[PDB]
């Protein structure tokens, strides 16, 4: 099914799906570009609510806890039901230099209203300011702390993890160094949602181009790169780009793609060495879908959002 060519030619996107990329193209080439304002008046416009997109509303459910890191506190963002079937370990997406724990809080309270996970998303230090390896550090100590205290906290050891782009990115690097550095291979499950695998960049990521400005540019994925790792960095390095890792024993995982993503190439090569390690592994695409296609209204995102969720509660029981 996700290697059915006629998944990814023209015929296959539906007139929905077209016009809500048009529309978010013409957007964004309206709107001020992020790298003409810069990294931290970007972040305060997005903050602020004035960027490209509206403001995503706060649940009052939410509450922190702030946990111990290498750079100091880290927050960790709940979102919990009244008798938790176990954790999402969860990091949010933004080329490791944009985003928040809190930036998602629909999407959390959603997941967790249907699985009966108890949902916590990570504050993990940003990029530039924090390069490489700060982020992954931070992720490691969010993981290294719930698996010593879920049970203490949430009264559950079943624990899953997952992200969107560079978060997916994340959680896969997070999982790796759970195993090498900790000997740990006890989360249960994967939701990897058009994550970066590969930070040497995939052929489908240096060919995408900048000439539509579909969320996600090739230019977007340059400024990244010169953001979140220093000079000094092999992007071969396992840690760095985890499509270079041995994926022995990992979770089952889900790849959530769209075919009209800069990335699609790490979903499908991820995937593609996920099973060929002996995993478990699900690939999901889905025609004419723009990278971060599962936050837009429309049937296609309403599917990947029906899937992915499905994934997760198929862990608790
Ligand atoms: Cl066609």
């Known amino acids: 099914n996700p290697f059915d060519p006629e998944l990814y030619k023209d015929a296959a996107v539906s007139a929905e799906t077209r016009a809500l990329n048009t529309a978010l193209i013409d957007l964004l080439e309206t709107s001020d570009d992020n790298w003409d304002i810069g990294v931290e008046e970007a972040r305060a416009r997005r903050d602020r609510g004035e960027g490209p997109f509206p403001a995503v509303p706060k649940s009052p459910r939410a509450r922190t806890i702030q946990i111990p890191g290498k750079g100091g506190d880290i927050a960790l963002r709940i979102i919990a039901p009244e ?18 724990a809190d930036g998602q809080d629909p999407m959390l309270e959603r997941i967790s209203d249907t699985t009966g996970l108890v949902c916590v998303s990570v504050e993990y230090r940003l990029a530039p ?10 992720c490691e100590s969010a993981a290294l702390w719930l698996v010593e205290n879920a049970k203490r906290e949430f009264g559950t050891d079943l624990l899953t993890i997952g992200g969107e782009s560079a978060g997916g990115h994340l959680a896969a690097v997070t ?21 970066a ?24 994925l340059e400024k990244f790169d010169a953001c979140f790792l220093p000079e000094n960095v092999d992007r071969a390095d396992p840690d760095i780009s985890p499509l270079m890792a ?36 699900e690939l999901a695409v889905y025609p004419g879908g723009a990278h971060g296609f599962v936050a837009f209204p429309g049937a296609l995102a309403a599917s990947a959002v029906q899937r992915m969720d499905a994934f997760l509660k198929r862990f608790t029981d």
């Open 175 to 195: 999982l790796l160094r759970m195993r090498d550095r900790h000997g740990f291979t006890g989360f249960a499950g994967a939701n990897l949602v058009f994550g």
């Open 83 to 100: 008798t938790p079937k176990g954790v999402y370990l969860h990091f949010h997406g933004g080329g490791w230099v944009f985003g928040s």
């Open 129 to 138: 300011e924090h390069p490489y390896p700060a982020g992954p550090d931070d």
């Open 246 to 281: 041995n994926l022995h024993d990992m979770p089952p995982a889900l790849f959530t793609v769209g075919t009209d993503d800069a990335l699609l190439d790490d979903s499908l090569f991820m995937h593609a060495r996920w099973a060929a390690a002996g995993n478990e592994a």
């Open 197 to 220: 695998f590969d930070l040497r960049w995939t052929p489908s990521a240096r060919s995408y181009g900048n000439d539509r400005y579909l969320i996600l540019r090739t230019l977007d």
